[PDB]
Amino acid sequence: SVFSERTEESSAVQYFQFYGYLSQQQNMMQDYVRTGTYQRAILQNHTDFKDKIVLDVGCGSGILSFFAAQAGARKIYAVEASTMAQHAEVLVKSNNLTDRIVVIPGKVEEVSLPEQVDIIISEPMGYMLFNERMLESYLHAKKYLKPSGNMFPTIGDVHLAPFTDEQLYMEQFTKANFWYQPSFHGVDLSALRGAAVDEYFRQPVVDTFDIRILMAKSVKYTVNFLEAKEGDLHRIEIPFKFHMLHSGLVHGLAFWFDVAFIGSIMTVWLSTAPTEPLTHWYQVRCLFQSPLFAKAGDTLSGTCLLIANKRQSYDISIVAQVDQTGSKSSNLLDLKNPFFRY
Amino acid sequence: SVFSERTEESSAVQYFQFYGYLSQQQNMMQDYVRTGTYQRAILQNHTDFKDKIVLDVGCGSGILSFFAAQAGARKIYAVEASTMAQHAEVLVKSNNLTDRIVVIPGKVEEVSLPEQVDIIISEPMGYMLFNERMLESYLHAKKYLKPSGNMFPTIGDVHLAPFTDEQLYMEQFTKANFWYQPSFHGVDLSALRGAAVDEYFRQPVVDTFDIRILMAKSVKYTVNFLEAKEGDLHRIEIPFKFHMLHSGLVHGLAFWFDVAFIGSIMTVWLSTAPTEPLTHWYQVRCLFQSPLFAKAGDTLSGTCLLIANKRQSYDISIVAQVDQTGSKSSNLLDLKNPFFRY
Numbered sequence: 001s002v003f004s005e006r007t008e009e010s011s012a013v014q015y016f017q018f019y020g021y022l023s024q025q026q027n028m029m030q031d032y033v034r035t036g037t038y039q040r041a042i043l044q045n046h047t048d049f050k051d052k053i054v055l056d057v058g059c060g061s062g063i064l065s066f067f068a069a070q071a072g073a074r075k076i077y078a079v080e081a082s083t084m085a086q087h088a089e090v091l092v093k094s095n096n097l098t099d100r101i102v103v104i105p106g107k108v109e110e111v112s113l114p115e116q117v118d119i120i121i122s123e124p125m126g127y128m129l130f131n132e133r134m135l136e137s138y139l140h141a142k143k144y145l146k147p148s149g150n151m152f153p154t155i156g157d158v159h160l161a162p163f164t165d166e167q168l169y170m171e172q173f174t175k176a177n178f179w180y181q182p183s184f185h186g187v188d189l190s191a192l193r194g195a196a197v198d199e200y201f202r203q204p205v206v207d208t209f210d211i212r213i214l215m216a217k218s219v220k221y222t223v224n225f226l227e228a229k230e231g232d233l234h235r236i237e238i239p240f241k242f243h244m245l246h247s248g249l250v251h252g253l254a255f256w257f258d259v260a261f262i263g264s265i266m267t268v269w270l271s272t273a274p275t276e277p278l279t280h281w282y283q284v285r286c287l288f289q290s291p292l293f294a295k296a297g298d299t300l301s302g303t304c305l306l307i308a309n310k311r312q313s314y315d316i317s318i319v320a321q322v323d324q325t326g327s328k329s330s331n332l333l334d335l336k337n338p339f340f341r342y
Numbered sequence: 343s344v345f346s347e348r349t350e351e352s353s354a355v356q357y358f359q360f361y362g363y364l365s366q367q368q369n370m371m372q373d374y375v376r377t378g379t380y381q382r383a384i385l386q387n388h389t390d391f392k393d394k395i396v397l398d399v400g401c402g403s404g405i406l407s408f409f410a411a412q413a414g415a416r417k418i419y420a421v422e423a424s425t426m427a428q429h430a431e432v433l434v435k436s437n438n439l440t441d442r443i444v445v446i447p448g449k450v451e452e453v454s455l456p457e458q459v460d461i462i463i464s465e466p467m468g469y470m471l472f473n474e475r476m477l478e479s480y481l482h483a484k485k486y487l488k489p490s491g492n493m494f495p496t497i498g499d500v501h502l503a504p505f506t507d508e509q510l511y512m513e514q515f516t517k518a519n520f521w522y523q524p525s526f527h528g529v530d531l532s533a534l535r536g537a538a539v540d541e542y543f544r545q546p547v548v549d550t551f552d553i554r555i556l557m558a559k560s561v562k563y564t565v566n567f568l569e570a571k572e573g574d575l576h577r578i579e580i581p582f583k584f585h586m587l588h589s590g591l592v593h594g595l596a597f598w599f600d601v602a603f604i605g606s607i608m609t610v611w612l613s614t615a616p617t618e619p620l621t622h623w624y625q626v627r628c629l630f631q632s633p634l635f636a637k638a639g640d641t642l643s644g645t646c647l648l649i650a651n652k653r654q655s656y657d658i659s660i661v662a663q664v665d666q667t668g669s670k671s672s673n674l675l676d677l678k679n680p681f682f683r684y
């Protein structure tokens with residue numbers, strides 16, 4: 001299938017094992033910003049669901065399908081590849097919704113649906129929006145979408161901004177400098193210091209921070225899920241030009257994302273911005289191995305390049321320069337090995 | 343090979359990926375009890391190494407092989423299956439030991455050694471001693487051991503003891519009761535509460551605790567690594583009869599382990615007991631589904647059965663009874679999915 005062709009079996013096994021746990025579903029369901037915003041998006045846009053046919057891509061517990069049923073959907077096909085499909089079916093029966101929600105076990109790339117649908121719903125967002133590569137499954141599912149059908153969420157905006165955080169930088173450097181020691185119990189480790197620094201700086205940092213660390217207004221990169229093809233997410237090139245508002249050391253780029261549910265009644269946003277209540281996505285920071293000095297009024301330009309890999313994640317390339325001095329930094333990060341600092 | 347026959351490829355991929363990170367090797371190296379005890383066992387038993395041939399099974403960074411070199415070994419074969427083998431080779435060169443330490447990339451079950459060895463060294467211990475199944479690789483490596491060669495560590499003792507911890511027991515139901523709600527955003531979750539309780543109780547708990555929670559002296563189960571065969575670790579039956587020292591409710595069994603390095607000069611112990619400074623092994627607790635009342639002077643008897651699985655771990659079966667009252671309890675636990683409570 002499209003899924004197995006792009007995914008190493010060992011990554012897939014671990015991925016679906018992880019989502020098969022009730023405790024993991026519980027953790028996500030308890031993220032009230034997420035669950036509450038989805039419910040509001042669906043219920044306030046009840047006309048997009050009333051008497052409609054729905055596809056729920058990766059239904060987990062089934063929660064979003066229940067919201068589609070509360071909004072009056074005629075039929076909801078709830079697709080789920082983990083063993084959580086069995087628990088979803090239990091809930092559909094105990095909530096007396098067997099006439100409206102149909103659980104379909106399997107990968108959305110592999111199953112068969114009996115009819116086309118009016119609207120697709122899902123929660124396919126990972127860290128930095130793209131981690132887990134579930135957006136590709138979401139877009140793949142448009143093979144089932146009627147012409148002029150809708151997608152909830154409809155669009156995703158990735159935000160990036162330069163930050164200064166000397167304490168974060170020093171923490172990662174302090175850990176790598178373990179490998180400087182010329183006599184760790186009598187052993188010279190220092191030939192590995194470079195490899196250690198590289199490994200630590202390849203880890204995106206997942207946690208939150210005060211917005212005062214941001215040195216310029218964010219640049220926005222938008223993916224329109226109604227128009228995008230799955231292949232568009234294999235290589236994602238994000239150019240940026242920041243107008244520096246504060247002078248100082250730039251230690252890296254911070255990332256967050258917003259999604260919008262563009263319904264017929266209203267547009268509802270779910271934001272993971274550092275100005276908004278915290279979610280289990282936090283925000284993500286990519287450190288530079290050497291920080292760049294910039295003055296207020298300078299321009300920091302470059303490209304963030306995300307290349308999808310078979311471990312359901314991305315290899316991240318960030319190249320940035322301060323245009324006024326030609327100071328350049330090039331960084332490679334492995335989104336599959338984040339440092340969970342929170 | 344013997345390794346691939348007993349291990350699902352997906353478990354192996356994740357396992358060797360995890361040990362391939364410099365940060366993980368660093369975390370283990372910084373566990374002073376471990377690193378310091380190994381160095382002392384090797385250096386204080388210098389006659390077991392001076393001018394000898396050594397095998398280091400799963401060398402990681404190579405640290406134990408450097409200790410064997412400090413003690414005067416003539417030749418050390420250092421086997422490692424992860425990409426950490428490349429980093430170990432860098433260290434051997436930078437420490438000017440290419441004439442003495444030979445790094446051999448691959449699994450100890452699959453590589454070829456050019457000669458038999460006088461002594462095998464390794465750190466094959468996981469949580470509860472047996473997790474990861476690396477002890478089987480250690481025992482497998484005795485195909486290379488000269489008659490009357492030595493093993494460092496030489497023996498391992500698993501300790502089990504009954505504990506009382508009302509707060510830990512109650513925490514399982516507190517977490518599971520998330521599901522016991524008839525209208526979580528309009529949805530009746532209650533039909534999944536039993537499945538949630540079952541899932542939480544299947545997880546052994548990795549953390550430390552105060553020794554005052556222990557209700558009896560530990561029962562010890564000893565594996566002698568000089569004598570044991572690989573096959574002896576496929577099914578590990580640990581009978582127990584505890585003579586209760588304290589009256590109260592028994593919520594489960596606590597596990598730790600010690601290993602001894604039995605050298606020609608002295609025996610050195612590495613203990614992970616809760617009376618000793620903490621290690622990254624912590625201790626492990628397995629709950630009973632139902633707590634058992636016992637009085638000081640009663641006997642709590644039963645069996646802990648560990649059955650090896652192809653995910654490099656064990657299915658744990660515990661049955662226990664209070665002999666004086668006939669009150670009985672069990673659990674089945676999945677050592678591959680522990681709850682890291684620390």
Ligand SMILES: NCCCN(CCCNc1ccccn1)C[C@H]1O[C@@H](n2cnc3c(N)ncnc32)[C@H](O)[C@@H]1O
Pocket residue numbers: 003015016019020028029030034035038057058059060061062063064079080081082084106107108109123124125126134137
């Ligand atoms: N960002 C984390 C998303 C976690 N879940 C969402 C469960 C819905 N729950 C919610 C939503 C909002 C608030 C609270 N709970 C994703 C599930 O999608 C499953 N999956 C992934 N890929 C595929 C595929 N190709 N085919 C079929 N299934 C797939 C996965 O196994 C998850 O179970």
Ligand SMILES: NCCCN(CCCNc1ccccn1)C[C@H]1O[C@@H](n2cnc3c(N)ncnc32)[C@H](O)[C@@H]1O
Pocket residue numbers: 345358361362367370371372376377380399400401402403404405406421422423424426448449450451464465466467468476479
């Ligand atoms: N907690 C136990 C894990 C620690 N060890 C490395 C530690 C080196 N010792 C010390 C001692 C004190 C402080 C720091 N390090 C694991 C490594 O063993 C490797 N491995 C496992 N199985 C096999 C096999 N079948 N074939 C070849 N290699 C194997 C694994 O890849 C680890 O790198």
